[PDB]
Amino acid sequence: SKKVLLVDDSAVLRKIVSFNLKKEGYEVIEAENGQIALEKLSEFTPDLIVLDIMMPVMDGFTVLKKLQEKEEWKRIPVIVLTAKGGEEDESLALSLGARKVMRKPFSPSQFIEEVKHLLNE
């Protein structure tokens, strides 16, 4: 019953995040880039967004920024899950609106722990 908007240009990453999310019960929806990601929000509104940074066409910091502009998108929490490991990259994403930032390589159980923590409150 909990929709989660998975957003990463790597098809591999998608498979395995989508697998761990479907273990808990969640209902994944997948997007190759930021543009597409934003493009599928017309369709539905998710309880969670799992956002990459480095994608083609549209970037992940750009998705986060737009997430704060439109008022229906501000309240939905973003986890950022990125290979960008700089402390400087984390602060930009947090300041751009992301609720947590997880690095890659990641632990699927922690990511899940954290995905729960946002949804449960």
Binding site: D9, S10, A11, V12, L13, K15, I16, V17, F19, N20, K23, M54, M55, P56, V57, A83, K104, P105, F106, S107, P108, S109
Partner: protein
Amino acid sequence: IDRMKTEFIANISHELRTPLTAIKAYAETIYNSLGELDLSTLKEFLEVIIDQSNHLENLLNELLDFSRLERKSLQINREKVDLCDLVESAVNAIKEFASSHNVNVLFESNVPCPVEAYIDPTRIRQVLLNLLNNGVKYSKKDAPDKYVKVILDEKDGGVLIIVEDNGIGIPDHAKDRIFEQFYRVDSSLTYEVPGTGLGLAITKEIVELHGGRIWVESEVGKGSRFFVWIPK
């Protein structure tokens, strides 16, 4: 230069982290989901681990071949070889990487096959795959047609291989600079594409050990043609 050294060190870490994330994710999932994984899913998540190690191994063999050529250990071993089979074989092996970015890979021969030559087939297969891989890696972001054609010919009592693409192309400020160790063009459209900058520095140097040369031609945002020439 110490400048491009540091970026290179960062690029290796950047390029080795992608398969590793996979390995780590798939390996922990399998280990934490044996009861929740069916068989064709177990075998698949393993196949990813195996597949992403092979990407890793490649990238380590890039570093190693490079260092080898830097210390001039890499002597080639020449034999009579059909270059038509070599190239078919080589593109066959790039079909998966291609289809993942939706690039098609064609192959014509302007002369009739088979095309014999005195070359190390390990090492020219390596040259073909590096040029094909760059064809796939530097294709345009979205397009209906995206491609990489290899072309065979016989010019100047030698063999002339062209690897043609319709990808992003190269600014003239980097038609001389693409072959130097560590060099990459840093635009908006190469940001998230991985690579060390060594691939062509190796390919230039393998080709030059055969007594051959490689040159490039590129129209910025329309495509590129890479010319490898080896003697008979």
